[PDB]
Design a protein around this nucleic acid. Structure first.
Ligand SMILES: [Zn+2]
Ligand SMILES: [Zn+2]
Lengths: 180, 40, 98, 48, 51, 242, 42, 54, 49, 213, 190, 151, 79, 101
RNA sequence: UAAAUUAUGGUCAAUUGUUAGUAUUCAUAUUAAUUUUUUUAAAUGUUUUAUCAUUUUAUAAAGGUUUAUUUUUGAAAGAUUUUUUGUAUAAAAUUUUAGGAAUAGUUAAUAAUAAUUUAUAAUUUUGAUUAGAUUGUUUUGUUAAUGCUAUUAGAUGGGUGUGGAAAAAUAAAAAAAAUAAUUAAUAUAUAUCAAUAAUAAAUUAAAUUAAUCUAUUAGUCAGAAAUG
């Protein structure tokens, strides 16, 4: 949409782009390289602020030691730690509710967090991608079926409101004699 | 709440020694003129 | 119970305490007015409550001071009083170490 | 330190470029200040 | 704020001490009790006590 | 150029890189000279396996340094050969007498750096000679037949497909891991039983066998095997909140 | 003003060898009456 | 005017402290996600065929 | 991206069923505060009169 | 506040009637002041409609001089104030070894005076309700004035120096020694005039009025 | 870092534990003034230039600054600054248009003192009531012309003397006796 | 999805809350409490505390009436529960005498203004001159090249 | 420092080497180098001093200003 | 401290002393007539850890927050990513925001 | 016009120059620098599309500005079976120069007006217009500290008026409409104006992967140190 495009730096569409959970981090000497994880738009100006939405955290790509805990005889604890600070709740509001695009290195991290499922590009090179066929796919659903009366619930309380005002303890909000 | 430690104060002058009073000045230490009624 | 306050004679290492590397001999460190130094584990033998803490919320005035100035402008041999350092000989005679 | 002041600090002229400075004036000034000083017990008693 | 040479927001919160390599003071095997007081704990001005 | 200056990375073993003027000078001027109480060979009684693991020819030929010219704490960067395994390195007698620092591969002969001997994880010969035949011939198999099945020892082996030398962990081969470490793949047996290029083939066999059997490939077949085989008896389920 | 106009740093005895040279140097002929039982320290 | 220079070379005694050199536990990623390579396929059998293709 | 868009909703069931509770509670507290400062303005109006 | 919870227990159960008393016992007395050897007559309280203001005074004490106000002329002058002139009245009198000063009378001038007197820097003061003046009797010791120095917070009036409670807490903290020595008078937001010690014991800061010690 | 000492510096990339990352700009540079004119030849007429300028705004010095805490914020709560402004309506001669002259607050931090400042505004007044002097309230809106973003939002006192001066016919305010300050000795005789 | 859910529910270790996924703890934009920030004067969060005069006001815990409220008209509920000192409390407690007086404010105060000097009751131990690098009988060991100070 | 024009050291161009006599009580025959340089299109003349030495003919001169010398009016000296 | 007490600061204490009587002599003078609050008792018996340990058993730490493993978020892609959560490190994440930390 | 404390409550303010009768921010100091040292950079070919077309990819060249630069869903995020809405240009505060005065497509109302509509119009000494330096309002330096002294780079008119917004004639280091790729952060000698290295500067050695570098100047009357 520009007469003379900017060549290394075109994104898909538009001047202020969709929000994206990028994980930038300044390129200097590897020892001095840690990653500014942050929400922001696709199409930025040259720096990381003018469409910065909401600083989201920082990652240490350099695996550090248990020099904050004592020397356990526990392996998985003695292993190096790789640390990151998220903004879990503003990530949920941006990603979940405002729908910002989750880039792939940041996703590679949050996958390790446990927020998001392990990404598309954590490819176990060592196992092939799948083979889809309708006969077996329908034969299974045939075999194991789940009901409308167990699926509509989860649909509701997983994408719509889930605070079930327990019908019994809605009694505490239905007043008594002086106004009943 | 007074993060000035009393335990790290005073500037060291090498060997120059300066007196410090444990409690009160050596003058006001003794009180004979008043315990012994030697007064106008 | 006193804490194990920082920047003692013992806590600090050489290049900080003095301004040369000084051996950490566990025997006969005369410059720390020390005679021997058995080094059992830091906090093993002392009772547990005594481990009060580590205070260092002050100035290491031996080593770094606020608003450093040459004490005596003249003669030029003077810095702040935090620049204690012996004399650097001319070309350094390195013996053979047995 | 010849008086024994462990916690003190004297400043003269605001800076050593401010004239007049001289060994005479320095010694005279600091001793004059130490004279002008009032004790705390004297401050108190003065206030009764 | 972010990814310019002078990042601020990654220090704005508190990150434990990264000792992954020699960032200058042999940070990775040298453990730095006194180096932290004198050196990396920020200060009230040059030389003042560790804040 | 420019990136010559960049320091070589130092990990969690490497102490002082000595990579600048004052970083070497005050240590440069230590003009060591070997005296008869410096001489390592005077001290065979205490350091017998430090004497017996010196690549002496490799040393003298390359270095101009003699077995006699060796201190018991010699800071010079000489070559050794492991007397347990038989790999070659360039290590100074100082960091090997002060610290028991040695072969980057016999570093892990013991299963876990932290609890090194407690492992009652069984040995190699008294447990699985089917590795004793695939391991590369060393004449030290008499001792390695006691390496634990759980050892990270990057042991070299004979492959069966390409016959060549492939080096893998004794644990990554054997499969079993000491209770409570980072466990290894469910199929690491089938993906290190062969060569790094010839370990591909023995795999996709059972993978296409099911594409054929079912007309469809979906990795969920192992899962469904576990549910069609292993019924959970009483797995406590939490009181719902809804 | 500028310290190195009309001439550069006087390199004079840059190693100042008099503080080094020891034509009299104790040898195997240390005195067993004035040197230690090791004959290394006086 | 500061035609002279700094007023102290603040340096720190390197000293190795015995917790950083304490033994880390490791597990090479080729013990969790094994690495192997695909023997060559007909469309790309050679490592010159490969580069001709890419 | 069936799970990846299953979540983009779940985090609207979670970020709203939490903004519900928390704006409820912010108003229950800012209401005590709003009401109390309002009462003080009324009282200082009395003492002024 | 703890010395009243168990001193106000004297409430009977009945909310009883309050007793009528003599025509007046609840009226505030006047403070004694000899009428013949005097600075100004301690004017009564009944004449409370005769009292004018500092700026515009009544016609009282014809026998006596009247202080004048202190209001400059241009831009180039600092704008003095009663708090400035009271501090330099007192400074000059303690420098002249006077006894009574006739010192301007504004609410925070006698504010400063009542707290100085509480702090002992002054042998006494008196408000004759003289709309303009009031008299401060100075205290001496060993020949030298007890008010060692007394400064206004501002040599100007156009510059009010509100003191942060932390500012006022870093005066009573001399290098780790708690020091209520130099007394600082600041007029809070509540239209009270208090020293910095009661100002930081209640964590409120006020306009800076004077420093004194 | 800033709190570190020159020789104790190692690494200008990161800040290890905490603190303030910032570029120690070089304020100490002897900015200069290259005289490109002669003391009698300047291409300006009023304010000649002969030494370096201190440049900026919210940076010049004496450090004047914005202060909202003035008459306006004492009387009115505002949504956004400048909304409500009270003044002596001065100048209305543009038909249906008023010029309201009301003050703001210019605080000098260094001195610890203020000076509020004057400004002749444009203020629409449909129906031409106000006369020069009515103390009026003026509020902001959508713009009304090039220059009037305001409208006469009330009167606080109408110049009743003036309104009757018009009713009688005279000028509601006599005009200033003299003009702006000049430099020429205008010799008015008779 | 179905086969994974089957195996997941077959996993016992599951069915626990992962508090990263389960709730947005504080979804609004602002904290639930003033967190060390500055104050009206700039007294940065350390030089201050919450609850002082800068807070929102606390309001009168009563009603502010005109003329005939508490001036001898009658009495509120705060008039029967209050008790005169002579008659005992309803319920017995074994209050300490010392705390009774303390609570009241009549205890003879023993503060630290009254604390005399803490004297060196026991002479500590004689401090023999520990030798330094400025106590060397011979100006040789104290050269410029060996001794830069006594310790 | 008018002609240093703010930089720490300023380069100029030899023209004349005339000798001026210092200010009393001092005595000498001080070497004043009348130099020039173009800068900011105007070209300028700089009467300077010489404390350095000269081996090769070089109208490259590094005028850095210094204190006062026994010569009245020469604020610039050589590097 | 450099507090200056007015001439009659001690009247409050003095009438409390002139009037306060004691059930018998030993309540009149016992060594714990100074100690009024738990601060007073700890500042007294802090040196005496044998008394402090029993008296203030709360500063003694016994309890804590257990190390509680979660159940894990389930993935739909099945074993084609059942490595994808598994590295040779631990991964520690601390949430921040306006509210926490 | 009352003292009071249930005893350090609310978290560090603190100024280190050898001068030369005396008055006075004013040579010599220290701090931050600059002068000064190659451990941060770097490449060309944007990419799809149905095709001589078209969908996608919008503020670093300067341009000299001090009453100044301001704006949205309709693009996109973005989810359905259809026609679906009212949120935008405005401002407001702060504006330099020794000797200071006049400036101009003009001000307001009408107006979807008037290249010749109406008029006592508007800017200004509360410092206007011209001209001059200058990038405009959380980044520094010093100082115990009001201060003093700093911060970059980005918007330089309209002319077929495309687009959501003209910001659009080459100057990332954003994966750019199929998971390409991350076993990757490395980048050769190429550059901009950033980015303070002399990293134990001199006896005991580097649980390394053995990688770059051979390492130096000052003074010598005052005042550390002098004679030929
Ligand atoms: Zn080995
Ligand atoms: Zn093979």
């Amino acid at each position: 949409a520009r007469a003379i495009i900017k060549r290394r730096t075109p994104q898909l569409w538009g001047a202020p782009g969709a929000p994206i959970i990028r994980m930038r981090g300044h390129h200097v000497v590897w020892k001095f390289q840690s990653y500014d994880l942050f929400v922001e738009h696709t199409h930025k100006r040259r720096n990381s602020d003018a469409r910065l939405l909401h600083y989201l955290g920082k990652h240490c790509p350099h695996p550090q030691k248990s020099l904050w805990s004592p020397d356990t005889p526990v392996a998985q604890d003695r292993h190096l730690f790789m640390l990151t600070t998220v903004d879990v709740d503003a990530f949920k509001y941006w990603f979940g509710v405002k729908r910002c695009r989750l880039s792939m290195r940041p996703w590679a991290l949050l996958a390790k967090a446990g927020l998001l499922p392990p990404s598309l590009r954590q490819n176990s090179k060592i196992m092939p991608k799948p083979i889809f066929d309708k006969e077996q796919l329908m034969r299974y659903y045939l075999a194991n079926r789940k009901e409308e009366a167990t699926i509509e619930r989860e649909d509701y309380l997983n994408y719509k409101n889930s605070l079930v005002k327990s019908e019994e303890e809605r009694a505490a909000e239905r007043p008594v004699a002086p106004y009943l | 709440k007074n993060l000035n430690s009393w335990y790290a104060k005073g500037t060291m002058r090498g060997g120059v020694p300066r007196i410090y009073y444990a409690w009160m000045r050596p003058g006001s230490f003794t009180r004979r003129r008043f315990e012994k009624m030697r007064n106008p | 119970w006193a804490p194990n306050m920082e920047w003692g004679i013992e806590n600090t290492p050489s290049q900080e305490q003095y301004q040369e590397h000084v051996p950490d001999t566990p025997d006969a460190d005369f410059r720390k007015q020390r005679r021997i130094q058995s080094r059992p584990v830091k906090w093993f033998y002392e009772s547990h409550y005594t481990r009060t803490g580590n205070f260092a919320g002050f100035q290491p005035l031996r080593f770094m001071q606020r608003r450093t100035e040459r004490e005596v402008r003249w003669p030029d041999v003077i810095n702040a009083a935090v620049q204690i350092q012996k004399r650097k000989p001319d070309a350094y005679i390195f013996k053979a170490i047995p | 330190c010849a008086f024994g002041f462990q916690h003190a600090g004297c400043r003269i002229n605001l800076k050593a470029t401010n004239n007049p400075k001289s060994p005479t004036h320095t010694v005279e000034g600091v001793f004059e200040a130490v004279k002008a000083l009032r004790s705390v017990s004297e401050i108190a008693a003065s206030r009764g | 704020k972010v990814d310019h040479f002078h990042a601020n927001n990654q220090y704005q919160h508190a990150w434990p001490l990264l000792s992954h390599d020699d960032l200058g003071n042999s940070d990775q095997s040298n453990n730095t009790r006194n180096i932290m007081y004198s050196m990396y704990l920020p200060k009230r001005n040059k030389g003042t006590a560790p804040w | 150029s420019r990136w010559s200056s960049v320091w070589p990375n130092m990990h969690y073993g490497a102490m002082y890189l000595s990579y600048s003027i004052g970083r070497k000078l005050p240590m440069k001027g230590v003009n060591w000279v070997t005296r008869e109480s410096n001489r390592l060979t005077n001290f065979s009684n205490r350091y017998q396996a430090v004497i017996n693991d010196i690549d002496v020819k490799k040393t003298e030929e390359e270095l101009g340094i003699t077995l006699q010219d060796i201190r018991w704490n010699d800071h010079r960067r000489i070559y050794w050969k492991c007397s347990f395994c038989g790999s070659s390195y360039r290590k100074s007698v100082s960091v090997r007498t002060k610290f028991h620092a040695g072969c980057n591969f016999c570093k892990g002969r013991y299963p876990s750096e932290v609890l090194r001997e407690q492992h009652q994880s069984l040995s190699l010969a008294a447990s699985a000679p089917e590795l004793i035949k695939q391991l590369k011939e060393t004449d030290k198999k008499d001792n390695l037949g006691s390496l634990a099945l759980t050892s990270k020892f990057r042991a070299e082996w004979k492959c069966q497909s390409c016959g060549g030398s492939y080096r893998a962990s004794v644990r990554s081969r054997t499969g079993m891991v000491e209770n409570g470490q980072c466990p290894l793949h469910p199929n690491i047996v089938d993906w290190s039983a062969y060569c790094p290029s010839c370990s591909w083939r023995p795999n996709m066999e059972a993978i296409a066998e099911e594409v054929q059997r079912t007309g469809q490939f979906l990795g969920l077949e192992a899962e469904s095997r576990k549910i069609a085989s292993a019924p959970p008896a009483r797995i406590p389920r939490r009181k719902k909140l809804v | 003003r500028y310290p190195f106009n009309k001439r550069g740093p006087r390199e004079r005895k840059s190693w100042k060898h008099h503080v080094l040279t020891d034509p009299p140097k104790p040898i195997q002929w240390r005195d067993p009456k004035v040197w230690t039982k090791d004959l290394t320290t006086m | 005017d500061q035609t002279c220079g700094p007023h102290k070379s603040y340096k720190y005694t390197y000293m190795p402290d015995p917790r950083k050199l304490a033994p880390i536990e490791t597990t090479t990623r080729s013990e969790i996600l094994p690495l192997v390579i695909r023997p060559p396929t007909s469309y790309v059998p050679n490592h010159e065929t490969f580069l001709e293709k890419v | 991206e069936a799970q990846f868009e299953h979540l983009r909703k779940v985090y609207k069931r979670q970020w709203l069923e939490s903004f519900r509770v928390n704006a409820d509670e912010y108003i229950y507290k800012y209401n005590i505060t709003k009401a109390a400062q309002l009462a003080q303005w009324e009282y200082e109006m009395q003492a002024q009169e | 506040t703890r010395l009243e919870r168990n001193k106000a227990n004297g409430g009977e159960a009945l909310p009883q009637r309050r007793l009528v008393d003599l025509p007046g016992v609840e009226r505030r007395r006047d403070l004694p002041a000899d009428p013949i050897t005097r600075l100004f007559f301690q004017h009564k309280g009944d004449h409370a409609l005769y009292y004018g203001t500092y700026d515009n005074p009544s016609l009282q004490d014809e026998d006596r001089i009247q202080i004048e106000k202190r209001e400059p002329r241009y831009w180039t002058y600092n704008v003095f104030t009663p708090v400035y002139d009271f501090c330099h009245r007192i400074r000059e009198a303690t420098e002249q070894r006077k006894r009574f000063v006739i010192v301007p009378s504004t609410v925070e001038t006698r504010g400063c005076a009542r707290v100085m007197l509480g702090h002992g820097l002054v042998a006494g003061f008196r408000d004759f309700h003289n709309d303009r003046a009031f008299a401060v009797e100075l205290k001496y010791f060993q020949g030298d004035s007890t008010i060692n120095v007394i400064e206004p917070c501002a040599y100007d009036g156009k510059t009010e120096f509100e003191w942060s409670p932390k500012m006022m807490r870093r005066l009573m903290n001399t290098h780790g020694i708690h020091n209520r020595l130099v007394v600082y008078i600041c007029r809070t937001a509540d239209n009270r005039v208090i020293d910095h010690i009661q100002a930081v014991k209640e964590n409120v800061g006020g306009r800076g009025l004077i420093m004194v010690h | 870092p800033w709190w570190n000492f020159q020789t104790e510096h190692r690494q200008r990339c990161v800040m290890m534990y905490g603190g303030s990352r910032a570029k120690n700009t070089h304020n100490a540079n002897h900015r200069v003034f290259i005289k490109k004119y002669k003391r009698n030849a300047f291409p300006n007429r009023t304010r000649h230039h002969w030494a370096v300028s201190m440049t900026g705004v919210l940076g010049q010095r004496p450090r004047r600054m914005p202060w909202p805490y003035d008459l306006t914020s004492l009387i009115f709560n505002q949504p956004r600054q400048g909304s409500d402004k009270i003044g002596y309506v001065v100048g209305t001669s543009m038909l249906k248009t008023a010029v309201v002259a009301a003050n703001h607050m210019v605080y000098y931090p260094k001195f610890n003192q203020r000076v509020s400042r004057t400004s002749r505004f444009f203020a629409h007044d449909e129906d031409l009531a106000c006369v020069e002097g009515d103390l009026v309230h003026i509020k902001q809106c959508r713009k009304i012309s090039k220059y009037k973003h305001y409208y006469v939002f009330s009167i606080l006192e109408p110049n009743i003397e003036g309104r009757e001066r018009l009713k009688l016919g005279l000028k509601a305010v006599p005009p200033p006796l003299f003009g702006y300050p000049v430099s020429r000795r205008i010799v008015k005789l008779n | 999805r179905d086969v994974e859910e089957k195996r997941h529910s077959r996993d016992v270790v599951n069915e626990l809350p992962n508090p990263w996924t389960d709730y947005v703890s504080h979804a609004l934009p602002f904290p639930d409490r003033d967190a060390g920030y500055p104050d009206e004067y700039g007294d940065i969060g350390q030089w201050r505390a919450p609850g002082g005069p800068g807070s929102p006001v606390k309001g009168p815990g009563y009603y502010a009436p005109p003329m005939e409220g508490e001036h001898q008209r009658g009495y509120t509920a705060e008039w029967r529960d209050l008790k005169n000192p002579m008659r005992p409390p309803e319920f017995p407690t074994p209050w300490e005498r010392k705390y009774k007086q303390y609570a009241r404010g009549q205890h003879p105060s023993y503060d630290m203004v009254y604390a005399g000097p803490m004297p060196e009751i026991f002479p500590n131990r004689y401090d023999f001159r520990k030798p330094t690098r400025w106590d060397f009988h011979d100006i040789e060991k104290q050269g410029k090249y060996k001794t830069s100070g006594p310790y | 420092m008018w002609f240093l024009y703010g930089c720490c050291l300023r380069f100029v161009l030899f023209v004349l080497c005339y000798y001026m006599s210092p200010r009393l009580p001092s005595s000498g025959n001080r070497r004043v180098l009348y130099a020039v340089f173009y800068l900011y299109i105007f070209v300028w003349c700089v009467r300077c001093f010489f404390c350095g030495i000269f081996i090769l003919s070089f109208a490259l001169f590094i005028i850095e200003g210094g204190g006062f010398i026994d010569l009245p009016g020469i604020k610039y000296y050589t590097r | 401290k450099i507090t200056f007490y007015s001439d009659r600061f001690l009247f409050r204490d003095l009438v409390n002393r002139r009037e306060a009587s004691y059930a018998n002599v030993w309540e009149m003078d016992d060594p714990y007539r100074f100690l009024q609050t738990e601060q007073d008792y700890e500042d007294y018996w802090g040196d005496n850890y044998d008394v402090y340990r029993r008296m203030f058993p709360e500063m003694i730490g016994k309890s804590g927050e257990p190390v509680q493993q979660y159940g894990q978020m389930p993935v739909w892609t099945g074993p084609h990513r059942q490595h994808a959560n598994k590295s040779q490190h631990n991964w520690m994440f601390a949430e921040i925001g306006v509210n926490v930390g």
